[PDB]
């Protein structure tokens, strides 16, 4: 039962990027998650003038990726099956520009080599975060460059940081929408490593493992948050008749087919912690990335069961890491 | 905390259809759900010799449909965007034959007219139910004909009936798998009607709204059911290194795009009640069907919120009907 | 000389059904037998004269990785599996998917009714709507699919009016101009590399040869010639708006699931050379790309003929020619 | 007479980048201007001589329903929205998606930085890899996309080496045989029905005319002629295995999302007539089908030319011819 963070009513007429001398800020959030995942780096930058920002996951070696662009209102660039970086940003479709800044920065680091096998590949996805503030500032090329420059191994800024600066949840009615943030979680099991990163800007609300609504759809008249379905069902009885962007990164080798099905499974699992989810109103996009370092055993047995060690098993574990990250974003 | 229904170990060498004089049985289940949904009929038939069966949803006028074949191991026939019937069956891919029986029975009722606009369209999906018994009997053409002949408005046989005869859940290890069944639920809100039908044969387990595991992955050594992720995570720590078929039927007019996104949303929502879900091991297939009788208002407001009456709202309500149906199947 | 017409005639869209007849499957021989060498692949074609309608079955008992490209707007598909023991192509619109159920249960019987996972027999089926081309409602049923599998043999394919091609037809701007096609196959061996194409063209469009000549479909009995449909369509718009093909490509070259899927799309799109228009709303065009995984491509793609000359795309280009040859055999 | 060669020359795969130059956008004029009448649609083409590389922007300020058919195996796409205010086609591989960001922010500025939903400016962008055809790493950047939008005018299209077509090339079995193409457009009006095709062919394959002659790409300087790639591929397999095109079709005819999506697939597949091979692993082929929703098809599809003659498939067949004309203009 956290204190409310109501976003408040829309403001119109606000200034855009051209109005300011915009200075990127290295986002620190409310606290830093630290973890051990060699070969992965994360950077987060924001403009205070939005407030809005971008979060970049950089895997300099490049990593095989599956994309599950499941929502009805997706803002995606690249969506490549192999990436050197994933860029998550505010600013609606304008914020895809941040990924261009990452791309060209990587081209510069590569000394402008352009062989087809050396192209630097950045996939980007965005949230609409303009209802949560009163400017039109968006993550631009310079901000994406800055988020990459700020990237370091083994750290993630929780909360209002990067793409999470103006993320919000619970959009039955804007008077009940609350600011979320971005979140991350990490587990290591044996040699296996799983990192989840999420920027929940859902139409739905964030739900914990007990089924409590913990962020979004807060009614100041009652002091209580509501699951949206209670609102929806009563709206129907009255009147008829009268986005989350996310990444899961692991080091377990998966074939393209396993990796794709892993992405679908983990993404669907997020309907536990975000409700409703995968709606027409949402642009929900999950990237499943593997650094392809650790083999699963050829056969799937253990003391825990004959079918206990396989990609589905990994997907179930990763689903829990992701739920933890969603709850960090809503905290 | 229901009593266990352990399916027990595989049996091999069992007899197939050719060995028996197979008599269809009208399935009655453990109890009958009654509801008011003109233009929809449901029939369920089984062979005791399996035990295995088929469940047919017949909409004689035909209805617009979206299919969300999300699992990794799908057994689907037709998958049409307009259907006169949906056939759900056991018998793995062999059980798609039941839908052929429905199709030809409908052709006969149409006096063998064959104009392109008069083709009778049946979409079928199947579960693998051979690990839950010791015969190779499957739902054949005759059984699909029988399920159609047995179809009546406004009734559904809950539990071990039709396609649910030998459905089972919780497949980390076969020694912990439990028999489920089929389930249905129905709500009417104003003029809006929503019927959910489900045959859960998941690799995962059935979970209630409190987060309790209520069917599947039962350990006779402990007397307790386990969420699979506890098994999976310990299997990884040890060793590295050392299907649900469903339909939602409503009467609300939705465009092809709304109906498709509605299908995705409702299907993903089932990861609340079935965990894990949408895995590589599963052939999860949802049909979203509308009889296109009731308009939504042109604008989405109500006293409950500015964005409270739309297809996403309907999807959230339908998601709850579906969860109720899953819990009926597991009861 | 322009080919003689094979007009289908005016459709009635109905007639007696299967049980009005004592239906005996006939092993289809077509007009000619293609013979080829590709062990592990058998083809069977059966028909009912009383339709006339039929089914063609490709049986690969080892099982083979498959990509499905269901590109048309009116597809009739069952299974569509990424690994198949058989592919069943049939007439009878969606009713003819039943033929594949006959193949499936016959294969289960051969496996002594074993039902373990590695033992499930996987049959993907696709259909053409062939009811415009005859005055009956007979369709390929379980018995006909069983018969087509029983008749399957390696190294033979009956060209023309045979199996699923028995009542296939082309050129559907107006039914008065529609012509019977057939089924067709072609085969090439390049060293030990093997490519087999099988096609059952029932297009809304017409069959076109490598010169751009319309050779089957859209025959106007008032002119004695076949025009490209676009001439009819453009004239129709001036007046009124004033100011399925099912196919398989089978190869022995190893391709990963990703390469195989893209190969399927490439070969399928290539068929818009020989069938025009293609991939329309009005078509249920479905191509199965199957590999028996017997021989590897070299690790690098060079040859004397270029730096990017030996790869799955190259194989796709070669297979596209085999498929155009098969289309032309169907229309011959 | 066979067309003269335009060999691209041997690629070095790198060179100076954008900020090595003081880059001024140039309004591209190409070899010739196509003129046509289609109010509500503007086209702008800009290039950097220092690449050479460029971008071509189609601006539809009302916004228009769109279907995207990203059929190739190596696609570079941003947005891919089902409703667009602009389509941006560019060189520079994935770096050139940045040009579309320039278009997007220019449109936001025109809207006075309003950010409501109905006001979000939607730009879909696609790219070709044109770095093989020049010795620099200059790409279409935000400034070049802004310039292409500023230069956009109704009723004009610069054919040839212009905009995104500036360094487009064809026929990539071996880089020694690759030839510069260009961009191309064609237009037809049938009563008030309007169809505009725009294409930037950078294929692995070659451009083929209606006779089946290879007209651009795969020019062998040792023979003085262009062969179909399949001749090279089949010879390569004998030896070594011993025993992108981005495009738009814009029409004013109303089509539902379902019809429009199938129309996109149909027209895109039709391009395997003029580009061969096509839809390969090696290609990022992406077609945008856009309707401005100005005129209805009749409710029933009949005419004097047939019972099924006036429908979205018919429109697709006509549009496929407009697109082949555009491909040939690009290769001319």
Author numbering:
A (entry chain A), B (entry chain A): 19 to 260, 267 to 355
C (entry chain B), D (entry chain B): 18 to 260, 267 to 355
What text appears in the publication on this structure?
Nylon hydrolase (NylC) is one of the three enzymes responsible for the endo-type degradation of the by-products of nylon-6 manufacture (cyclic and linear oligomers of 6-aminohexanoate (Ahx) with a degree of polymerization greater than three) and various aliphatic nylons (e.g., nylon-6 and nylon-66). However, the post-translational autocleavage of the nascent polypeptide between Asn266 and Thr267 generates an active enzyme with an α subunit (27 kDa) and a β subunit (9 kDa). Based on the X-ray-crystallographic structure of NylCA, we reported that four αβ heterodimers (molecules A-D) form a doughnut-shaped quaternary structure. In addition, we proposed that the nucleophilic N-terminal residue Thr267 in the β subunit functions as a catalytic residue for either autocleavage (from precursor to active enzyme) or substrate hydrolysis.
To extensively analyze the effect of amino acid substitution at position 122, we constructed 10 new mutants in which Asp122 of NylCp2 was replaced with other amino acids by site-directed mutagenesis. The values of Tm (melting point of the heat denaturation) and ΔH (change in enthalpy for the global unfolding of proteins) were determined by regression analysis using nonlinear least-squares fitting of the CD melting curve. The Tm values increased in the order of Asp122 (wild-type NylCp2) < Leu < Gln < Asn < Arg < Lys < Val < Gly and ranged from 52.9 °C to 75.1 °C (type 1 mutation in Fig. 2). However, the D2 symmetry was partly altered by mutations at position 122. Plotting the protein stability (Tm value) estimated from the CD analyses against the distance between the two monomer molecules revealed that the protein stability exhibited an inverse correlation with the a2/a1 ratio (index of symmetry). In other words, the ratio changed from 0.979 to 1.197 from the wild-type (Asp122) to the mutant (Arg122, Lys122, Val122, and Gly122) enzyme, although this value should be equal to one for a perfectly symmetric structure. A clearer correlation was found between thermostability and the nearest distance between the side-chain atoms on helix α2 and helix α1. Notably, this distance decreased with an almost linear correlation with increasing thermostability in the wild-type and mutant enzymes.
